[PDB]
């Protein structure tokens, strides 16, 4: 089953996932939207600095040159 | 394009901070489509070093962190394509 990353991000949009950035911090939230350039927009996310909770900030637009990877749960 | 917005603001005394923390107070002269900022009347305070006088400066557009604009600028007639 060929699962390219672009139908992965256009198919599993809406489920609560977590992105991780280059600096080592993690965003817990469900994906609202994503383009062909792989900019992402996720809602009501939560901030983990190295796995530790910091506070409430809101919904986040994340850019190409900031993200490290995109995993689930 | 917003960079095409930047070339409509010539002859304005703005400040520019780059990615190295260097701050430049000066009058802007030239704006390229790659945001290559050609300045004159330059007061350049490098981060943790002494401020210097410069006559003409040429900043490459990639290494720009941000601009700061004065209070007397009507942008509402300047963003119109």
């Amino acid at each position: 089953l060929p699962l390219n990353p672009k139908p992965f991000l256009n198919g599993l949009t809406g489920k609560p996932v977590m992105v991780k950035l280059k600096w080592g911090m993690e965003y817990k939230g469900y994906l609202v939207s994503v383009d062909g350039y792989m900019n992402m927009q996720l809602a009501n996310t939560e901030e983990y600095i190295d796995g530790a909770l910091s506070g409430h900030l809101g919904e986040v637009l994340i850019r190409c040159n900031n993200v490290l990877y995109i995993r689930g749960v | 394009k917003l960079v095409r917005f930047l070339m409509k603001l010539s002859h304005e005394t703005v400040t520019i901070e780059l990615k190295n923390g260097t701050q430049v107070h000066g009058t802007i002269t030239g704006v390229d489509v790659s945001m290559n900022t050609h300045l004159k009347a330059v007061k350049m305070t490098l981060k943790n070093r002494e401020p210097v006088q410069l006559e003409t400066l040429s900043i490459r557009g990639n290494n720009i962190r941000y601009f700061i604009l004065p209070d007397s600028l009507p942008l509402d007639t300047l963003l119109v394509d």
Partner: protein
């Protein structure tokens, strides 16, 4: 001759134990099983896990989408 995109295609044919390196990150590496690529070499991993160099604590990641602007090496086992 072999071009590297056909070898990534052979990797997703073989579902091998791909260990991916990272740009600027000499410590933190990721094991995974590749499924697909694109034109900009963005890579999904089936069962990914994170391995440090001084700590070496294997944590579970799942099916990740690691970007093209981060990877360095696609090695096996």
């Amino acid at each position: 001759m072999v071009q590297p995109i056909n070898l990534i295609f052979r990797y997703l044919q073989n579902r091998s134990r791909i260990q991916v390196w990272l740009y600027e990150q000499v410590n933190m590496r990721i094991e995974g099983c590749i499924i697909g690529f694109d034109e900009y070499m963005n890579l999904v991993l089936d069962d990914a896990e994170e391995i440090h160099s001084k700590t070496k604590s294997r944590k579970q990641l799942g099916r990740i989408m690691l970007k093209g602007d981060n990877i360095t090496l696609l090695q096996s086992v």
